Amino acid sequence: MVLSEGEWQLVLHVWAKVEADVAGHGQDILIRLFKSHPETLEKFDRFKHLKTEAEMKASEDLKKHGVTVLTALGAILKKKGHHEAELKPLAQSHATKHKIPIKYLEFISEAIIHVLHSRHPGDFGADAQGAMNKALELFRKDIAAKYKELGYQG
Numbered sequence: 001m002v003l004s005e006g007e008w009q010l011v012l013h014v015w016a017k018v019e020a021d022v023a024g025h026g027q028d029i030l031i032r033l034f035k036s037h038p039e040t041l042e043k044f045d046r047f048k049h050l051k052t053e054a055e056m057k058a059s060e061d062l063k064k065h066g067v068t069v070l071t072a073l074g075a076i077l078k079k080k081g082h083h084e085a086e087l088k089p090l091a092q093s094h095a096t097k098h099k100i101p102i103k104y105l106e107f108i109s110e111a112i113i114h115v116l117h118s119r120h121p122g123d124f125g126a127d128a129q130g131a132m133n134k135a136l137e138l139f140r141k142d143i144a145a146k147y148k149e150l151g152y153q154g
């Protein structure tokens with residue numbers, strides 16, 4: 001809800017390792033999301049036809065969308081909570097057009113933490129994880145509040 005400066009530094013330090021391979025991370029993240037919560041796949045008319053993990057990894061458009069996710073997320077994270085203006089378009093499209101429940105944001109948050117562990121086994125320790133979890137939570141809580149402001153959910 002409020003991150004210390006240290007936690008924000010941890011988040012941005014970790015995020016710089018995402019930005020080193022945005023496509024790899026975004027692809028993995030979407031794949032983990034889709035494998036651990038298949039219900040989220042059917043939200044994607046572009047991808048709902050992808051079943052095996054090998055198929056999803058061969059989907060360039062899935063990779064492209066991973067980039068879109070993470071670049072949008074990274075722009076938000078870099079604001080260190082001052083992401084009001086960056087969230088509204090995301091909240092708007094995910095509440096009203098995509099109809100994404102906040103719970104689905106929790107699933108992708110888990111998929112982010114998981115993927116960061118499997119791509120950075122020595123770089124993503126307990127502190128960095130706590131910091132990243134708090135950042136994604138704040139993100140999810142603020143998105144929740146922006147849903148409510150658009151008159152949606154919860």
Ligand code: HEM
Nearest residue numbers: 040043044046068069072073090093094098100104105108
């Ligand atoms: C960190 C969390 C997330 C971020 C930053 C994010 C970001 C974005 C962005 C930038 C777009 C493109 C512009 C737009 O449509 O608003 C998009 C589209 C979309 N998002 Fe998300 N998203 C997140 C979580 C999710 C989750 C968890 C789901 C569903 C389970 C989802 C479903 C969709 C869908 C269906 C689209 C349209 C896809 C398409 O047009 O092919 N999003 N998202």
